[PDB]
Every structure is written in structure tokens, then in C-alpha cells.
Write a protein that binds this ligand. Sequence first.
Ligand SMILES: *[C@@H]1O[C@H](CO)[C@@H](O[C@@H]2O[C@H](CO)[C@@H](O[C@@H]3O[C@H](CO[C@H]4O[C@H](CO[C@H]5O[C@H](CO)[C@@H](O)[C@H](O)[C@@H]5O)[C@@H](O)[C@H](O)[C@@H]4O[C@H]4O[C@H](CO)[C@@H](O)[C@H](O)[C@@H]4O)[C@@H](O)[C@H](O[C@H]4O[C@H](CO)[C@@H](O)[C@H](O)[C@@H]4O)[C@@H]3O)[C@H](O)[C@H]2NC(C)=O)[C@H](O)[C@H]1NC(C)=O
Ligand SMILES: *[C@@H]1O[C@H](CO)[C@@H](O[C@@H]2O[C@H](CO)[C@@H](O[C@@H]3O[C@H](CO[C@H]4O[C@H](CO)[C@@H](O)[C@H](O)[C@@H]4O)[C@@H](O)[C@H](O[C@H]4O[C@H](CO)[C@@H](O)[C@H](O)[C@@H]4O)[C@@H]3O)[C@H](O)[C@H]2NC(C)=O)[C@H](O)[C@H]1NC(C)=O
Ligand SMILES: *[C@@H]1O[C@H](CO)[C@@H](O[C@@H]2O[C@H](CO)[C@@H](O[C@@H]3O[C@H](CO[C@H]4O[C@H](CO)[C@@H](O)[C@H](O)[C@@H]4O)[C@@H](O)[C@H](O)[C@@H]3O)[C@H](O)[C@H]2NC(C)=O)[C@H](O)[C@H]1NC(C)=O
Ligand SMILES: *[C@@H]1O[C@H](CO)[C@@H](O[C@@H]2O[C@H](CO)[C@@H](O)[C@H](O)[C@H]2NC(C)=O)[C@H](O)[C@H]1NC(C)=O
Ligand SMILES: *[C@@H]1O[C@H](CO)[C@@H](O[C@@H]2O[C@H](CO)[C@@H](O)[C@H](O)[C@H]2NC(C)=O)[C@H](O)[C@H]1NC(C)=O
Ligand SMILES: *[C@@H]1O[C@H](CO)[C@@H](O[C@@H]2O[C@H](CO)[C@@H](O)[C@H](O)[C@H]2NC(C)=O)[C@H](O)[C@H]1NC(C)=O
Ligand SMILES: *[C@@H]1O[C@H](CO)[C@@H](O)[C@H](O)[C@H]1NC(C)=O
Ligand SMILES: *[C@@H]1O[C@H](CO)[C@@H](O)[C@H](O)[C@H]1NC(C)=O
Ligand SMILES: *[C@@H]1O[C@H](CO)[C@@H](O)[C@H](O)[C@H]1NC(C)=O
Ligand SMILES: *[C@@H]1O[C@H](CO)[C@@H](O)[C@H](O)[C@H]1NC(C)=O
Ligand SMILES: *[C@@H]1O[C@H](CO)[C@@H](O)[C@H](O)[C@H]1NC(C)=O
Ligand SMILES: *[C@@H]1O[C@H](CO)[C@@H](O)[C@H](O)[C@H]1NC(C)=O
Ligand SMILES: *[C@@H]1O[C@H](CO)[C@@H](O)[C@H](O)[C@H]1NC(C)=O
Lengths: 580, 97, 119, 119
Amino acid sequence: NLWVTVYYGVPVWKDAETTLFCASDATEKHNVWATHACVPTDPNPQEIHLENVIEEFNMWKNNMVEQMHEDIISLWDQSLKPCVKLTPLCVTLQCTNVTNNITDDMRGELKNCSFNMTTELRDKKQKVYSLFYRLDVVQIKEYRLINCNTSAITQACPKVSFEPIPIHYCAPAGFAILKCKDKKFNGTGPCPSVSTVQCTHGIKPVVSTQLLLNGSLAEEEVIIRSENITNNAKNILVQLNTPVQINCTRPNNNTVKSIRIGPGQAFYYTGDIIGDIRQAHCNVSKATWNETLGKVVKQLRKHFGNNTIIRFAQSSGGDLEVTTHSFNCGGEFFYCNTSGLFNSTWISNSNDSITLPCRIKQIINMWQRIGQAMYAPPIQGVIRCVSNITGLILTRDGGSTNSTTETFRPGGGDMRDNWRSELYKYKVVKIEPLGVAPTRCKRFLGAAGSTMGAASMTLTVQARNLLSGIKQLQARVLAVEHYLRDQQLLGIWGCSGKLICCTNVPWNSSWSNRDLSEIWDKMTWLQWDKEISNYTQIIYGLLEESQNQQEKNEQDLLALDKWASLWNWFDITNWLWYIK
Amino acid sequence: VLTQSPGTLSLSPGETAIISCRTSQYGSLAWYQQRPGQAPRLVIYSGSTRAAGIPDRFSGSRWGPDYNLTISNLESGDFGVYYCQQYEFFGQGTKVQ
Amino acid sequence: QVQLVQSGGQMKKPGESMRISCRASGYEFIDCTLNWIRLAPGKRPEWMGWLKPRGGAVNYARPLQGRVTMTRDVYSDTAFLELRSLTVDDTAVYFCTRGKNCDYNWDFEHWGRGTPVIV
Amino acid sequence: QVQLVQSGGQMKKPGESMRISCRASGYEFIDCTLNWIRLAPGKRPEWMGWLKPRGGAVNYARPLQGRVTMTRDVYSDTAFLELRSLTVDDTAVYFCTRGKNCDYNWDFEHWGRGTPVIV
Ligand SMILES: *[C@@H]1O[C@H](CO)[C@@H](O[C@@H]2O[C@H](CO)[C@@H](O[C@@H]3O[C@H](CO[C@H]4O[C@H](CO[C@H]5O[C@H](CO)[C@@H](O)[C@H](O)[C@@H]5O)[C@@H](O)[C@H](O)[C@@H]4O[C@H]4O[C@H](CO)[C@@H](O)[C@H](O)[C@@H]4O)[C@@H](O)[C@H](O[C@H]4O[C@H](CO)[C@@H](O)[C@H](O)[C@@H]4O)[C@@H]3O)[C@H](O)[C@H]2NC(C)=O)[C@H](O)[C@H]1NC(C)=O
Ligand SMILES: *[C@@H]1O[C@H](CO)[C@@H](O[C@@H]2O[C@H](CO)[C@@H](O[C@@H]3O[C@H](CO[C@H]4O[C@H](CO)[C@@H](O)[C@H](O)[C@@H]4O)[C@@H](O)[C@H](O[C@H]4O[C@H](CO)[C@@H](O)[C@H](O)[C@@H]4O)[C@@H]3O)[C@H](O)[C@H]2NC(C)=O)[C@H](O)[C@H]1NC(C)=O
Ligand SMILES: *[C@@H]1O[C@H](CO)[C@@H](O[C@@H]2O[C@H](CO)[C@@H](O[C@@H]3O[C@H](CO[C@H]4O[C@H](CO)[C@@H](O)[C@H](O)[C@@H]4O)[C@@H](O)[C@H](O)[C@@H]3O)[C@H](O)[C@H]2NC(C)=O)[C@H](O)[C@H]1NC(C)=O
Ligand SMILES: *[C@@H]1O[C@H](CO)[C@@H](O[C@@H]2O[C@H](CO)[C@@H](O)[C@H](O)[C@H]2NC(C)=O)[C@H](O)[C@H]1NC(C)=O
Ligand SMILES: *[C@@H]1O[C@H](CO)[C@@H](O[C@@H]2O[C@H](CO)[C@@H](O)[C@H](O)[C@H]2NC(C)=O)[C@H](O)[C@H]1NC(C)=O
Ligand SMILES: *[C@@H]1O[C@H](CO)[C@@H](O[C@@H]2O[C@H](CO)[C@@H](O)[C@H](O)[C@H]2NC(C)=O)[C@H](O)[C@H]1NC(C)=O
Ligand SMILES: *[C@@H]1O[C@H](CO)[C@@H](O)[C@H](O)[C@H]1NC(C)=O
Ligand SMILES: *[C@@H]1O[C@H](CO)[C@@H](O)[C@H](O)[C@H]1NC(C)=O
Ligand SMILES: *[C@@H]1O[C@H](CO)[C@@H](O)[C@H](O)[C@H]1NC(C)=O
Ligand SMILES: *[C@@H]1O[C@H](CO)[C@@H](O)[C@H](O)[C@H]1NC(C)=O
Ligand SMILES: *[C@@H]1O[C@H](CO)[C@@H](O)[C@H](O)[C@H]1NC(C)=O
Ligand SMILES: *[C@@H]1O[C@H](CO)[C@@H](O)[C@H](O)[C@H]1NC(C)=O
Ligand SMILES: *[C@@H]1O[C@H](CO)[C@@H](O)[C@H](O)[C@H]1NC(C)=O
């Protein structure tokens, strides 16, 4: 004879999305990428491994990536908003080729580009000579700026840097982030080993289009991530085992000067170039890249036919962001031509650097929004970077009929792929603490894979985590509302007290009987919740009716006034005179 | 990579049309209709799911790496050319007459 | 409400280049792909390529690489298909298409009027 | 990081005036008091004064009152120490100093390079 019992806090998961808040480890640093709305990080104090749990991870549909895209866009816009506008600078420029002193070819396509401009006093004007890159300037020799006819240009504030700073994403109270620690996790499937972690592993916001930079590296081998790799539209993300070191630089002294375009507004421009005019370049070691492409070819050959000829090639077309590797170095935006590193062909089976040309634009329209642009101020002196090419993004040229050759090209344009490469492991799971089980009474997040009864001994800890700008307030208010809903349901069932509560409702055979022997011995709470999920509303309603309405009526004023010596008069009759 | 049969299907009004499609790849198969002189329009996707505005008359179901399009009680708005589609790959098309 | 409007009626002789514009409306132009389809009488349909207008990323069908270009204007929501080195086998109706949704783009519910091209 | 940078090496005669700049960087210049210290062999360290470069408030030491002025340029983040009627006994090395934190002023943690002045 087993009847229903109600447990509060049993560990179970619902995959609902939610707003995840900041966690950034702690004056110069405050200028860049930090809104100081972000709490200091605890030193990874709670990483509770969960033993013998199989959770379905799908990197491709997780709300954390979209939330991070919105958050990084908002961070960028907030940084740009209190900075000088360059609407005064949309003027007619008389541009001339940079002075080589003879007819020598101009390198980088720098253009002298004088203009009239304004000053602090409204009446006066000040002729200004400023070298502008040709990609920034468009003809109308009369010349104008590229984005004048479409979008207003907001200068980045001069002191502000853009260097990536790690951001840890931590779920609110009532939701717990689950990390998949499995090596060789291709991103979409069951994860053999799961852990509960409060905060993600300090994801770095780094913006790079073709080749991911400074990301996290795989442990064992290259991993090829793609949903339906047969599909052409879906990008193939590649996580590399070994970093490939890219050494990038602009070799120009770049003498910078400033003018005041208005009251409290300043404009920073390239006054002059002291040294020789030289192209920007990025070096990648040829042997390292050859080995990396060999490893990537092996992992790609696994998915397609083993006989297939895998050929790489330059990007077919698009905007300069898509067509070329984009990235910032020391505050200067580089667009580097990757055709040198992707034109090999691999047929079925040293100390020289592949030098990639690079062109630098000052006017950046990143995130590909309509109607917005930013002027990156020039940076004085020679700039260098030593990035690690930790990941690649590829797309397969499709439409071929038969033939063993597969053409892979660099791809991009959508920056969600960059953050998918780092947030692949993480999932957000809601905690639905309430649960109902059979038992013969008849009156954080650890041990999830542990069988029932083991959970109850630690039950309290889950009940402790619950209950702990506009979206954060909404998150907290919804956490409070969820807690009040759970407590109200617990009270309506008669279980005002938390923890174990026993209730007289007979365990119907219809409610997924299951034999009522292994249920409690050999089985964990999650598989139970999978079983009884459909019947839960009926159980809740029957609990409310049986041990709340009937219990109220049989413990209403009944027994409140108990004086009955002549009780059961319709039986006192039955042996009143019958004895006689 | 994929094909469909029969090439031409000569039926009268009120009869049921059956068109088979053989695929050599895993991937959801959609069926399109082309009225002569108009742009083609999707009639079903995912093998058996109908597009918006398509009547119950159109349906399809099959097992293995084959697909079937069944069209009961042919009407005047039928008698187009019917195309298989997999991941950016089409069949030669069946003309219903 | 999703609408794709094509300019057409062009006639070209072998060796000439050709351009088709496709104006898209009724939905956010940026976030959803476009595909180009070539339907000829008596031939199998040929898929020509896809274009992601957010970054303008383009994927051409392998038989037509080196001949086809696709570009786009986002301030006037237009997609331009340029085809070079026309031959007699390029006579067909050219369609600009978009999937049912922007996650699985191959379910082309939405098609343009169709641009006949005769060579 | 906190840095104070001075310009020095001034060579003056008796009776002339002198000006020493002190550029502050790293910390918010307008949220922390500066002090000016004088060091020399033989004689004790001497405090010249403190400067609060928000309101520009200044406090001078009694031996130097009427001879020493302090100014602040909040847009260049530059304090200035001007000394009049410079004489032989003012030959010394001058420091621009800041406390360890902006709550207690006399824990001079951040010192500049130093400004020699030879009369
Ligand atoms: C890209 O994304 C697509 C989806 O868009 C993914 O395609 C799907 O892939 C999965 C596998 O990942 C496919 O499931 C497998 O399909 C096999 C066949 O399933 C179809 O046929 C069976 C009947 O087959 C019997 O008869 C065959 C012919 O005699 C015989 O070969 C076979 O052995 C069987 O005897 C149907 O029951 C089933 O519903 C399915 O139907 C297909 O065709 C109909 C046509 O109307 C269509 O509606 C369906 O959508 C589908 O196209 C089969 O080999 C395999 O079975 C394996 O698993 C089962 C587990 O139960 C196990 O019992 C068995 O022993 C095998 O181990 C499995 O079911 C799925 O069908 C694909 N769906 C589509 C729409 O294409 C694709 O995987 C993905 N690519 C990548 C790389 O991720
Ligand atoms: C992937 O990750 C790599 C490795 O970290 C990054 O490479 C770093 O790049 C940044 C700039 O992008 C470098 O930091 C800058 O270095 C310059 C040199 O520093 C001088 O001063 C410091 C003082 O501590 C000395 O240690 C050093 O020897 C030099 O004398 C400076 O130009 C920068 O500081 C100046 O500008 C910044 C504005 O950002 C101000 O905050 C400073 O006050 C100052 O004015 C800055 O320090 C860094 O050194 C590089 N790391 C290396 C070589 O290991 C890649 O950028 C990253 N890739 C991508 C694509 O993001
Ligand atoms: C794609 O990979 C291909 C296979 O490696 C590369 O193709 C090779 O590219 C070279 C360089 O152009 C072709 O020409 C060779 O070049 C030199 C002579 O070049 C001289 O002139 C150039 C002027 O630009 C100058 O820069 C050089 O320093 C030299 O002074 C000779 O060694 C050869 O005879 C030859 O002509 C090769 O022909 C070509 N090989 C093949 C098999 O096609 C291609 O460069 C790669 N693309 C990218 C973008 O990296
Ligand atoms: C702003 O100006 C640019 C540059 O003129 C316009 O873009 C096109 O630029 C190409 C470059 O080859 C020219 O061939 C085209 O003629 C330009 N288009 C037009 C309509 O002239 C861009 O379209 C302009 N922006 C707006 C909103 O009109
Ligand atoms: C851009 O052109 C201006 C005007 O020709 C150059 O400015 C001149 O530079 C020379 C050499 O330094 C000076 O002697 C002249 O006095 C400057 N002229 C004016 C009107 O200021 C400028 O150098 C050019 N830009 C370069 C070389 O980058
Ligand atoms: C990136 O650099 C490569 C270097 O080869 C460029 O490739 C050339 O592209 C033009 C464009 O038509 C061709 O005419 C040349 O024949 C190509 N050269 C080779 C060796 O294939 C490529 O155009 C550059 N990309 C960009 C966006 O500037
Ligand atoms: C500048 O150089 C270009 C080649 O890049 C040349 O065509 C043009 O005529 C030059 N213009 C001037 C004004 O010298
Ligand atoms: C600047 O303004 C003056 C006003 O007289 C005008 O004559 C001149 O052409 C302008 N200069 C340039 C370089 O546009
Ligand atoms: C690899 O990804 C495929 C889809 O491409 C998925 O079906 C499969 O489960 C994954 N394999 C794992 C996690 O071992
Ligand atoms: C740029 O020129 C200045 C001129 O004073 C020089 O001091 C400096 O070293 C130069 N920069 C480089 C990177 O050589
Ligand atoms: C990049 O520069 C580092 C020093 O910063 C050097 O050790 C390394 O070999 C260089 N790598 C390449 C590929 O040039
Ligand atoms: C180096 O590159 C060549 C040409 O692409 C290739 O054949 C060879 O296998 C590569 N060697 C490696 C990966 O050791
Ligand atoms: C680049 O790679 C080296 C070698 O693995 C590694 O030690 C270093 O930390 C990497 N750099 C960054 C910025 O992660």
C-alpha cells in the first residue's frame, strides 16, 4: 500500500532560457569593455561534477549566444555614446596622392585630403591636412568620406581602448549553468559527463571574421562542429588543437595630431608619416599552418568520403569584413588578405612565413548594422600583436553533382559563430524543485545522477539556492514570483512545511505505476520526472482536492467541539431496546 | 544525386496522382508545384508537412530512402510540373497531364 | 506579406553580361538568406547560389563559379545577380527565393515573379 | 598603475622665479590630493604644501607663505609649483607626491622622478 508523497527541491532540469548576468574580475582597465555593472568573480568555487548523467547539449540553439550578442552590442554602443560626433567632418575634401617626392607608387593608398573644417568659435574655420586611407574616402579631385551619405560617424573616445577583457556569464538564482566537460564533443548530442558551474570560464569578447583569435583550444585533436555538414548554408566551425601564432603589424610611425572641432570636442587624425610608407603585414609560420591544415583535412575527411579530395580556396565574395580576416590590433583595425593561407589542395593520402597583406580602415562599421559607423582614431607609433589562431570558420561550396572534390572557403559576416565557439559547452537549465513520488508513509545540485532517497538527504541545499538593468529586475522579480508560486502550491496541498511531506492520496495504477520497487532503489529523480511529466497536473489537482478540501472539512469545526457521550444515536437506538 | 518518376503522368480529372522520388542522401525532401506561366510554389516540405494554404488533398509518406507524393481528386488548378528538392538539389520534374 | 519583386524581360546575345535586381519587402531584409534558382523548360532546375545580405556573404554553385556574382544594397533592400559569358544553354526563368524561415532556408515558400531570359 | 612625471634640471640664480610641472596619470586626477616635498642633503625633508585639484584649494607651509604658489590644469592633468624669490638655501630636489589612498593624505606611496634645482 503506497500513496503519494510530496518532495520539495528534488534536482530536475527544464531547458528554459533566461537572462544571465555579468561576473568580471576586478582604472585604466575600466575604460575598455567594462561598464562596471559587473560583480567581481569568485575563484570558481562551485564546480559540482554530476556523476552518471546524460544531458542533451545543442550548441546551435542556445539563448546564451543571442544574449551575449545583444550584451556585447550594448556594451559597444554604451562605450561609443559619450564620444564626439563627426557630423561636422562630412565635408568636401580635395585629396591628392601621398607625397613620394617622385612618381613612386603610394603604399596603403594614403591620400592627403585637405578640408576646411570648423573650430570652437562658430565664425572661424581652419584648413586641415589629414592623411586618410583610400578605403575610407569615396570620390564625388573632390573626395568625401565613405559613410556621409548613409550614416553618422561617432568617433571612439581617444583614451578608450578595445582590448578584450574576459567576461564570465553567471545564471540567476533558480537557474544553473551546466557545462559539458567531454573531450571530442562535436557540439550537438548527448554529453556523457556534466558539471554544474555558477559562472562560465571567462569568455573573451574578441571580434575576428575568418580566423578566430585567442579562443579556447581543444585538448586531444581538431574538432569540426557543424549542424548538418551536408548543408551548405551552415558554417563549419573548427577548433584547433595547437595554436598557430600570427604576428601582425602596421610598419608606419604615424605622426598623429589633434584639432578642436567645437566646444569640448576634439578630432584626432594622421598628421604625417615620418618613415617609409610600408604595407601592413601579418606573418604565419608556413610549416605550422601546413600541419594545421593537414589535421583539419583529416577531421573533414572523416565526415565526407574517405577518398574525397579536400581543397581549400580564397573567399569567393562579400564585404571587406567577410572577404578578409578582420581584427583590431592595439586599437587599429586590420583587414588582412587570407588568400595566401587558403589556396592549397589536398589529395587523398620550414622557417618561412606566409606574409598576408593587410589594409587598415579608420571608419569601421562592425556588427553590420544599417545606419551606424565608427571612426577609430589613429594610434601613434608602430603597433604589433602576437595573436593565436585558435579556431577557423569555413563554408563548403555546394551545388556540385557527383565529383569527389569539396571546396572549402573562409566564411563569416555573422559574429554569433565566434561566441558559439566558446559557449558550445554551456547550457542553462531551470530548476523545477517540486516533485511527487510513491511512499508507504500514508499520513549545489550534486548527486543528480544518484538514485532517489540519496537526493532527499541533501534536499535542503537546492531549496537554499532558490530566491538567491530592466532585464535584471525582471529576472529577480520572476525568481521571486516562481518561489511564491511554488510555496503557494505547497501550501494548497497541505504541505506548508518544506522538505518531506506525506499526504493521503492513493497512488493510482493509472499514474505510471512502474511496479513501485525499482522506482526508489535503482533510479534517479530526473528519469522519474521524465516518466510522470504528463500526469503531474492530475496529481496536483487530486492532491489539492484530497488533502486540502476534504482535510479541511474533516478537520473543520469537526473535533473543535467534542462532547459526545451519546454518540452515534442511530446506533444507540440499535441497542437501546434490542438489549431488552 | 536524386531522381523522380514517372517523367510524365497522363491522368484525367478526378483521379489520384502518385509520384515517386528516389534520394541518395539523408535530408528532408520538399515538393514544389509549377503552374505553367507562374512562379513555382511549395506544396509540401519535410516529406509530409503542408505549406500554408495547401488543401488536405496533397499529402505524402513513405519508408526508407524513398518518398511519395499522393494527390487525390485532381482539380483544375493541378496539372503543373512537380519538383523534388533536397539540400539545394532538384529532380528532373514530373509533368502531370 | 513577404514579397519579392523582380525586374525582367531581358534578351541577350552570347558573350554579353546580364544583371537582375530583386527587391525584397515585408520582412527584415538583413537577417534572412536569399537564393537564386534557374528554371529552364525541359531541363532539371539548377540552384545558382545563396547570399547572406548581413555581411554580403555569397556561395556560388560549383558549375557556375567564375561566372556568377551576387551583391546587394541594404539601404534599398535589393539583391543583384550578375551573370557573365552567357550561352545558348542559359535561357531560363531566374527566381529569387527565400526559405520558410531563416533557420532552414531550403523550404522556399516565397518566390519572385520570375525573370525570363532568352539567349 | 599611477604615474607622476616631472620636468627638471632648472638652473637659476638668486632672486629669480621657477615653475615645476607635475603631470599625473593613471588615477583620476580630480579625485586625490597632491603634495609637494623638498629634499636635500644635510637638512630635513620639508613639506611645501598640498593641492586639492578639484576646487583648486591649496595649503602652503608657514616658512614658504608669500613665496610659493600652486596651480592646477585639470584638462592637462598637470599640477604646477611656482616659487618666487628663489635663493641659495632653496637648492634642493623637489618631489610631487600622492598618498597611498585618497582618504589618508600622508602615506606618500606615489612619488615622481624628482626635480633637481641648483641655485
Ligand atoms: C541532416 O539532417 C537530416 C534531417 O534534415 C538528418 O536526416 C536524418 O538522419 C537520421 C539519422 O541521423 C535518419 O534516421 C535514420 O534513417 C534510416 C531510415 O529511416 C527512414 O526509413 C525507415 C525505414 O527504413 C527501413 O527500410 C529501409 C529500406 O528498406 C531500410 O534501409 C532500413 O534499414 C529499414 O528497414 C523509417 O522507419 C524512418 O521513419 C525513416 O523514414 C525516412 O523516409 C521517409 C520517407 O517518407 C521520411 O518521412 C523520413 O523522414 C525519412 O527520410 C535508418 O537507417 C536509421 O535507423 C537507425 O536507427 C534506428 C533507431 O530506431 C535503428 O533501429 C536502426 O537499426 C538504425 O540504427 C535511422 O532511423 C533520418 O531518417 C533522417 N531524416 C531525414 C528527414 O532525412 C541527417 O542525419 C543530418 N545529417 C547529419 C550528418 O547530421
Ligand atoms: C590576443 O592576445 C594577445 C596576447 O595578449 C594580444 O596581444 C596584446 O596586444 C595588446 C594590444 O592589442 C598589447 O598591449 C599593449 O602593448 C603596448 C606595449 O606596451 C608597452 O608598455 C607596457 C607597460 O606595461 C610594457 O610592459 C611593454 O613592454 C611596452 O613598453 C602598448 O601600446 C599598450 O599600452 C598602451 O596603450 C593602452 C591602450 O590599450 C593603454 O591602456 C596603456 O596605458 C598604454 O598607453 C598595451 O599595453 C599586449 O602587449 C599584447 N600582448 C603580448 C605581446 O603578449 C592580442 O591583441 C590579442 N589579439 C586580438 C586580436 O585581440
Ligand atoms: C596559390 O598557390 C599556388 C601554388 O603554389 C601559387 O601559384 C604560383 O604562384 C607563383 C607566384 O606568382 C607563380 O609564378 C612563379 O613566380 C616566380 C617568378 O615570379 C617573379 O615575379 C613576381 C612578380 O609578381 C615576383 O613577385 C617574384 O618575386 C618573382 O620575381 C617563378 O619562381 C616561377 O617561374 C613562377 O612563374 C607560379 O607559376 C604559380 N604556380 C602555379 C603552379 O600555379 C599562388 O601564388 C598561390 N596564391 C596565393 C594567393 O598565395
Ligand atoms: C552612398 O554612396 C555610395 C558610393 O557612391 C553608393 O554606393 C554605390 O557605389 C558604387 C561603387 O561602385 C557605385 O557604382 C553605385 O552607383 C553607388 N550607388 C548609387 C545608388 O549611386 C551608395 O548607394 C550611397 N548610399 C545611398 C543610401 O544612396
Ligand atoms: C599633404 O600635403 C600638404 C600640402 O602640400 C603637406 O604639407 C606641407 O608639408 C611640407 C613638407 O613637410 C611643408 O614644408 C609645407 O609647409 C606643408 N604645407 C602646408 C600648406 O602646410 C603635407 O606634408 C602632405 N602630407 C604628407 C607628406 O604626409
Ligand atoms: C587577396 O589577395 C589575392 C592574392 O592573389 C588576390 O587574388 C587575386 O584576385 C584578383 C581578383 O580578380 C585576380 O585577378 C588575381 O588573379 C588573383 N590572384 C591570384 C594569385 O589568384 C585577391 O583578389 C585578394 N582579395 C582582395 C579582397 O583584395
Ligand atoms: C594617384 O595615383 C593613382 C594610382 O593609384 C593615379 O591613377 C592617379 O592619377 C593619381 N592621382 C593624382 C592626383 O596624382
Ligand atoms: C576652404 O574655404 C575657402 C573659403 O574661401 C574656399 O575658397 C576653399 O576652396 C576651401 N578649401 C578647400 C581645400 O576646400
Ligand atoms: C556529431 O554531430 C552529429 C550531427 O552532425 C550528431 O548527430 C552526433 O550525435 C554528434 N556526435 C557525437 C556527440 O558523438
Ligand atoms: C617616429 O619618429 C620619432 C621622431 O622623434 C622617433 O623618435 C620614433 O622613434 C619614431 N618611431 C619609430 C617606431 O621608430
Ligand atoms: C612572432 O614573434 C615572436 C616574438 O614575439 C617570435 O618568437 C615568433 O617566432 C614569431 N612568429 C612568427 C610566425 O613569425
Ligand atoms: C605540406 O604541404 C604540402 C602541400 O600542400 C602537402 O603535400 C604536405 O603533406 C604537407 N606536409 C605536412 C602536413 O607535413
Ligand atoms: C598562445 O599560445 C601559447 C602556446 O600554446 C600559449 O602559451 C599562450 O597563452 C597563447 N596566447 C594566448 C593569448 O592565449
